[PDB]
Amino acid sequence: MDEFELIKRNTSEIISEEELREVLKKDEKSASIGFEPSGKIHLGHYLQIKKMIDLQNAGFDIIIALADLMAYLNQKGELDEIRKIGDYNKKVFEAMGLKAKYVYGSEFQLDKDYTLNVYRLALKTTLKRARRSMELIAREDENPKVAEVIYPIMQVNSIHYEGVDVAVGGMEQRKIHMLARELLPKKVVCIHNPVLTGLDGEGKMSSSKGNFIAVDDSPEEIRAKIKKAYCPAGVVEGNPIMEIAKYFLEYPLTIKRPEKFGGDLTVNSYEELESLFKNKELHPMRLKNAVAEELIKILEPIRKRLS
Amino acid sequence: MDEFELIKRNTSEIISEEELREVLKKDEKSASIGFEPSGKIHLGHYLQIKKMIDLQNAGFDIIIALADLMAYLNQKGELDEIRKIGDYNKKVFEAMGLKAKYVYGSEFQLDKDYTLNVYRLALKTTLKRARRSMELIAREDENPKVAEVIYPIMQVNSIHYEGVDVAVGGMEQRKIHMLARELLPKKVVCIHNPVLTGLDGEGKMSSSKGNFIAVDDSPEEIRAKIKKAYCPAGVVEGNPIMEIAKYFLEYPLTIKRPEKFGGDLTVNSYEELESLFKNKELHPMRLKNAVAEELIKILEPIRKRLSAH
Ligand SMILES: [Cl-]
Ligand SMILES: [Cl-]
C-alpha cells in the first residue's frame, strides 16, 4: 500500500488530498497534533497516535504539542497541575511506539513575538467565526467567557509557529483548522480522525466521562468495561465495540467460540465482521469477548513498558 | 478649596468618594491615565491632563500610560508608527505643567507573567461584559474582531500592574473601570472626566478636520475653528463653545461688545455665562470671539514651552 493510502486509512477526511500529494513530494515535511493533558490516555488518543505513526512511516517528522496552555484556556484547572498530567502522557505516547518531538505549549506560547501575533490574528478574526469554531470544543456554558475566542486564535498561531505541513486532529478540530487555512500564509494540510464513541454509547470517549478503555488498563478492567458496553445486536452505527474492531484489531481475525455456538470463526476484513454482526450471525457477548481478548494482546506492550 | 474638592471639580463621577477619601490619607499614592498616541493633542486631552495635575497637587504620583499596544489592538496602524506619535505627545504633556512618569505599554504588556494574567482574566470575564464595555470605545466595524474583547482585559491588567490607587479616564472608560473593580484584588478608585463635544457638534472631540482645538494650534486656526463651530443661540446642552467656557476659562470674564448692543459685560462665573446665554442676552458670535481670544491666552504658555525644543 502506498504512502497516500496508508495515511488516508481510517480518516474521516483530508483537506485536501491534492495538497497532501504535493506535501508527500517534499524531502522534509512535518506533522503535528495537540493533546490537552489527560489523566487517562485511552483508545481515542491511541487512534490519533496510530495516525501520527502512519505519517512518521511516510517520512514526516512528528511534533506532539502537549497543550498545557490550551487546556488552561479551556478551563482544566491550574497550569502547574496541567503540566504534571502531561509528563505522564508523554511516557504513554513513547510506549505506543511513536518517536517524535514533544513540545509543551508554555515553552513558547507566552514569548513576546508569539503573543504579538495572537493579537495580530485577533484583529483579523471575527467573533462570530471564533465562536463558531468552538461549538464542538468549548464546554457547555450559559455565559460564554472571552477565553473561548482566544483559544482558536492560539491554536492557529501554534500551527504557524510549528511550521508544519500537516495538522492532525479529531473532526471536532475541523473549523479551527479551516481558520488556520484562511489566516496563515502557508495553507496547512488537515487530516481528521473520526470521533470514537464512548462505551456507554452516548457521546465521545472521554476521561472525565468514565466511558473509556485506557491503554494501560489491566486485563480484568478491559474485560469488565467491554462486557458492560453498549452493543445492540445487529446495530453497527454508534456501536463502540464495532468501532474498536474497525480501528484497532488486525484482519484476518480468529474469534474463538465453543462448538455449541457454531465453533471458532475466521473474519477476513472489518466489512465481513460488519456483515456477520448486521445479520445477527455474531452475538454481542461473543464480539465483546473477542474484542476484549484482542485488545488485551494489542495493549500488552504498552502496559509492559509503563511498567 | 481642600484636596477632595479640587479633585472633584469638573468631574462627571468618582467611584467612590468614600474610597477616594481613604486613598487621600495615604502618604504615598498614585494615579494613572492611558492615551493612545494621537497626532493632535486637543482640549479633550488637556481637560484630562488638568485633572491629573489636580491629583499631582494633592500628593499623587502620576503615571501616563502611552498606550501604544492598546492603540495597536484598536487598529491604529503599525506599532513603531504608533510609538513615534507618542514621543511628541510626551513633550506636549510636559509643556502643560505635568510632572509624571511616562510608560509605554509595549515595555510591559508582552512580558510572560503579564500575558499569563491576561489569559487568567479572560477565563473570568464574560464575552457579553467585554463587548458591552467597548461600545463607546471600539471603532465602527461591520465584522467585529476578537481584539475588541481582549482590549478591556488588557486595560484591566495594566491597571493591576501599575499598582495605582486611582484610575482616571473619560466617561467612555466607565465600564472597563467597573470590570477592573470586579476582576482585581485591589479596588481602584475611578475618576471620570466629561466627554467634550466636538466643534461640529456631532460627536466627541477627535482629530476630525476642524472638530478639535489642538493645544499647539496657532491663533488664526483657533479663531477660524471657533468661528465655524456649532453654537446655537440659547442652547447650552451639546454646545461645544459653552463647554470650553465651562472647563477652561477663568472667571471673572470680560466679554467685549459695542455699546449699541448693550456694551461690554463682566461675568463672574460659568453659571452666570450660562444664564446670559440661555436668555439670549449674549449672541453666539460674541461668545465665540471671547472664547477664541481667551483660549489663545490660555494656550499661549503651552505654545511657548514647546517652542523651547
Ligand atoms: Cl455468536
Ligand atoms: Cl451679545
DSSP code per residue over chain B? --HHHHHHTT-SEEETHHHHHHHHT-SSEEEEEEE---SS-BHHHHHHHHHHHHHHHTTEEEEEEE-HHHHHHTT-S-HHHHHHHHHHHHHHHHHTT---EEEEGGGTTTSHHHHHHHHHHHTTSBHHHHHHHTTTTS---SS-BTHHHHHHHHHHHHHHHHT-SEEEEEGGGHHHHHHHHHHSSSPPEEEEEPPPBPTTSSSB--SSTTS--BTT--HHHHHHHHHHS---TT--TT-HHHHHHHHT--SSEEE---GGGT--EEE-SHHHHHHHHHTTSS-HHHHHHHHHHHHHHHHHHHHHHHT--
Q: Which three cell numbers stand for residue A168?
A: 492532525
DSSP 3-state helix, strand, coil percentages of chain A (rounded to 5)?
50, 15, 35
End-to-end CA distance of chain B: 35
Residues 6+ apart with CB under 8 A from A142: none
Helix (H, G, I), strand (E, B) or coil at A94: helix
- CA A216, A219, A220, A225 torsion: positive or negative? positive
What's the CA-to-centroid distance between B271 and ligand 2, angstroms? 16
Would an 8 Å CB–CB cutoff place B107 in contact with chain A? no
User: Which among A73, A124, A146 has CB closest to B149?
Assistant: A146
Would an 8 Å CB–CB cutoff place B72 in contact with chain A? yes
Residue tagged 509624571 (cell numbers): B100
**Calpha distance B101→B94 (Å, rounded):** 10
Q: Which three cell numbers stand for residue A169?
A: 486532529
Q: Which three cell numbers stand for residue A244?
A: 474498536
**Calpha distance B19→B188 (Å, rounded):** 9
Beta-sheet strand order (sheet of B166-170): B13-15, B189-193, B166-170, B29-35, B60-66, B101-104
What's the CA-to-centroid distance between B214 and ligand 2, angstroms? 27
Would an 8 Å CB–CB cutoff place A157 in contact with chain B? no
Distance from CA of A135 to the nearest CA of B (A): 15
For each of the domains in chain A, give its residue range(s) and CATH number, in order of start. 1-196 (3.40.50.620), 197-307 (1.10.240.10)
- Phi and psi at B158, nearest 5°, equal -60, -45
Residue tagged 474638592 (cell numbers): B5
User: Long-range contacts made by residues A221-224, C-beta under 8 angstroms, separation at least 24?
Assistant: A222/A292, A222/A295, A222/A296, A222/A299, A223/A292, A223/A296
- Starting from the CA of residue A257, give the closest ligand: 1
Would an 8 Å CB–CB cutoff place A130 in contact with chain B? yes
Distance from CA of B148 to the nearest CA of A (A): 8
Task: Find, in chain A, the residue whose alpha carbon is nearest to that of B149.
Answer: A146
DSSP, res A25: H
Cβ proximity of B57 and B95 under 8 Å: no
Residues 6+ apart with CB under 8 A from A231: A239, A240, A241, A242, A284, A287, A288
What's the CA-to-centroid distance between B231 and ligand 2, angstroms? 13
β-partners of residue B267 are B253
**Calpha distance A83→A88 (Å, rounded):** 9
DSSP A174-236: HHHHHHHHHHSSSPPEEEEEPPPBPTTSSSB--TTTT---BTT--HHHHHHHHHHS---TT--
Cβ proximity of A175 and A38 under 8 Å: no
Distance, CA of A287 to chain centre: 24
Amino acid at A177: H
Residue A146 and residue B125: Cβ atoms within 8 Å? yes
Cβ proximity of B189 and B23 under 8 Å: yes
Task: Find, in chain A, the residue whose alpha carbon is nearest to that of B114.
Answer: A110
Q: Is A275 exposed, middle or buried (0-12, 13-18, 19+ CB in 10 A)?
A: middle
Residue A146 and residue B128: Cβ atoms within 8 Å? no
Q: Report the phi/psi class of residue A145: left, alpha or beta, with left for phi > 0 and alpha for psi in -120 to 50.
A: beta
Would an 8 Å CB–CB cutoff place B136 in contact with chain A? no
> Which approach determined this entry?
X-ray
Would an 8 Å CB–CB cutoff place B116 in contact with chain A? yes
Amino acid at A267: V
The three-state (H, E, C) secondary structure of A31-58, written as one string: EEEEECCCCCCEHHHHHHHHHHHHHHHC
DSSP, res A281: S
Distance from CA of A81 to the nearest CA of B (A): 15
Distance from CA of A129 to the nearest CA of B (A): 9
- Phi and psi at A39, nearest 5°, equal -65, -30
Cβ proximity of B41 and B214 under 8 Å: yes
Would an 8 Å CB–CB cutoff place A1 in contact with chain B? no
**Calpha distance B222→B292 (Å, rounded):** 6
Cβ atoms < 10 Å from Cβ of A268: 10
**Calpha distance B273→B266 (Å, rounded):** 9
DSSP B38-72: -SS-BHHHHHHHHHHHHHHHTTEEEEEEE-HHHHH
Helix (H, G, I), strand (E, B) or coil at A63: strand
Cβ proximity of A197 and A170 under 8 Å: no
Mutate: best of A146, A149, A154, partner B, most B CBs <10 A: A146
Chain A positions touching B126 (Cβ under 8 A) are: 143-146
To one decimal, the resolution in angstroms is 2.3
Residues 6+ apart with CB under 8 A from B136: B171, B172
DSSP, res A259: G
Residues 6+ apart with CB under 8 A from A271: none
Cβ atoms < 10 Å from Cβ of A161: 15
Question: Pairing between strand A265-267 and A189-193?
Answer: unpaired
Question: Pairing between strand B60-66 and B166-170?
Answer: unpaired
What's the CA-to-centroid distance between A235 and ligand 1, angstroms? 15
Amino acid at A196: L
Q: What are the distances in angstroms from CA A41 to CA A72, A210, B129, B229, B294? A: 18, 12, 37, 70, 76
Chain B positions touching A115 (Cβ under 8 A) are: 110, 115
Torsion angle, CA of A48/A50/A53/A57, rounded to 10 degrees?
-130
**Calpha distance B73→B75 (Å, rounded):** 5
- CA B48, B54, B56, B58 torsion: positive or negative? negative
